[PDB]
Design an enzyme around this catalytic site. Structure first.
Site, PDB file in Angstrom:
ATOM      1  N   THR C 149      -4.712   5.422   0.096  1.00  0.00           N
ATOM      2  CA  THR C 149      -5.034   4.379   1.463  1.00  0.00           C
ATOM      3  C   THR C 149      -6.280   4.624   1.450  1.00  0.00           C
ATOM      4  O   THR C 149      -6.941   5.530   1.573  1.00  0.00           O
ATOM      5  CB  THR C 149      -3.963   5.196   2.474  1.00  0.00           C
ATOM      6  N   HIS C 201       4.325  20.520   1.320  1.00  0.00           N
ATOM      7  CA  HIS C 201       4.124  21.739   0.656  1.00  0.00           C
ATOM      8  C   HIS C 201       5.530  22.312   0.312  1.00  0.00           C
ATOM      9  O   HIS C 201       5.500  23.466  -0.432  1.00  0.00           O
ATOM     10  CB  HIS C 201       3.590  22.461   1.977  1.00  0.00           C
TER      11      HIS C 201
END
Lengths: 230, 230, 230, 115
Positions: C149, C201
């Protein structure tokens, strides 16, 4: 004298805790950062400090500049000045800005700061700062469309502020530190400060969050821009 | 040879995953940052390295300095050394510090580091680092009031560490990089490292999180302060 | 003319909002940062710009370099190129990279960028950027293993991108700013840009997230490394 | 092949030169590259290897004064000789073929950008 000390969670602390936890699970909070050169403002203060005090009986500080900048930003980005009400987006046509004052920390509200003069904003901020005596009535602690939280006072370099629902964003100031900077091909030391804008991505998008912070940066680096509206 | 390969989630990985997900949804985690000048310590190591080794049979490294600094910080901010137990705040009157060791990564516990000498902390840390053989017993992996996670080892500039419940905060070290810095009006290159303190805002507030990190910064930039207690 | 304006949440905005909220509650999102020296690439562009255009009819820009770097990184870290499917880890043996294009913002997919030449990547990216006309078919908006992005376009210094499930990570580019830097004992001004890699994570760990970002840094600072594979 | 790979294969053959070079190794080839710098060869004329159409001859790398943006600087220069069958390959091509080699060797990055 034992290895562990259990102290019961006071109802107030318990209420706060639940709030913070629901503040972070209800929203899609994100944080965008930037930095500002506090040289310009610091000079304005050195040059017109006395004059300002004599003429208004209130000392000129950083806050009024931040608040003025925030209002102009809020004016250019109503999305950031709006809330999400269930299935609605509530655009507020006024400008109340919550301002964190130490005491825990409390968020008194400055109402209609868009109509206040700097001297005035400087006085009101003092009132609330002073009422932090412990005479802060909830009629003072309610509302607010946006929040500005100072932290430089502690030596905070940079950090992630938590949104204050139903509000959509929060601006966190930090410590002003001298930092080498590239200025027209030459490296010069300037009083720099990082800005953190945390926002509810459910309502506020990148373009806006970024532009909102840039605008603040621009108007703080040259207050004159408030006048020319560029 | 196909476009997608599905491999079943091993029970261990699956357990970990759920933990991490509940670690982030149970707490109001926030992160505050700062930077430290590793010049002072790096010099201490160059000057007294040999001496330290001969006299203690263990090499002097960064860790013992970090741990000593953390304990002093934990001592000045018991809130950060406390946990939230349902409706309670459990202040621990001891100083166990979890220390992430690669293997996945594991959190062995250094117990009562407040009583250990640097040589000692240097040895124990090695023990656990070495047991990472795979002889890490859960009697080693349990407890801990605070966690220190190194990441500079990989080239990590700056990042957001995840809290390790029931613990309330976590300190993340990063890579030491030369960076131009303003030092008494003059720009000089110093071995700088960013520090990230992530914490449970349900228990720990700004003032504390900031001050906790500043203290670490101060004691790391001049270890002598540990002695004078200023 | 009243203090509050309630406008009904459009179904599209409402769908998006729920997504973002579930994106942040379903994953254990974390963010790791780093910086890159855009000098090398900027020079490549100045030196071979014309040539590239004449020979390929497409202008050489930053994107193709980012995408090439990302693919090589994704190749060295399949974990980051994998998704979590309930109780599974789905390793994708192909390389589709989602690329945010303004319009709200939309994520068109570049398919099999591992087989594309820079000229080609430059053309396809333009196609999608152009289709942003509003002729973006969902056959274009689906899939993608990773997302890149851009935000420098707005003046974004540094920020935290939100993951795009089922994807496991996202790379956020920012504004290129001149910044004093220590270069072989001497401080020199370089066009620096911060990189933010946010990741799940639950699937991706520190070592990997860090290394993934370092690799990108390395290959962007010396594209020749793509060729030598070092 | 990747560079590491080309580096390994070249070593294999260089090593098989033991004397275990099978004709299944010595046959074919579309083009030939012959090194000679190893001996101190400044510049020379390589002989084509039919049925192949051309041959590229490397030579010794020597420091040589060179004009570089109005200034004379010493650079590690090497001459390249491309001998070719003019029955099939013409000037334009032979020249351009050698220029291309020159360009890509002076900035390997060009292999990536394809310019």
């Amino acid at each position: 004298a034992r290895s562990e000390k259990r102290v019961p969670m006071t109802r107030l602390r318990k209420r706060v805790a639940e709030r913070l936890l629901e503040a972070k699970n209800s929203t899609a909070m994100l944080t965008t950062f930037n930095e500002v050169n506090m040289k310009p403002i610091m000079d304005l203060r050195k040059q017109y400090g006395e004059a300002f005090e004599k003429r208004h009986g209130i000392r000129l500080g950083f806050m009024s500049f931040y608040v003025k900048a925030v209002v102009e930003a809020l004016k250019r980005y109503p999305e950031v000045n709006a809330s999400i009400d269930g299935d609605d987006v509530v655009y507020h046509n006024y400008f109340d800005v919550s301002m964190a004052v130490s005491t825990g920390l409390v968020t008194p509200v400055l109402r209609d700061v868009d109509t206040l003069g700097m001297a005035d904003i400087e006085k009101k901020i003092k009132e609330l700062a002073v009422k932090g005596d412990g005479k802060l009535t909830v009629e003072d602690l309610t509302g607010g469309n946006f929040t500005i939280t100072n932290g430089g006072v502690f030596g905070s370099l940079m950090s992630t502020p938590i949104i204050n629902p139903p509000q959509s964003a929060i601006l966190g100031m930090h410590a002003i530190k001298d930092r080498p900077m590239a200025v027209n091909g030459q490296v010069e030391i300037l009083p720099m400060m990082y800005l953190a804008l945390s926002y509810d991505h459910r309502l506020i998008d990148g373009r806006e969050s970024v532009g909102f912070l840039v605008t603040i940066k621009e108007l703080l680096e040259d207050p004159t821009r408030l006048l020319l509206d560029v």
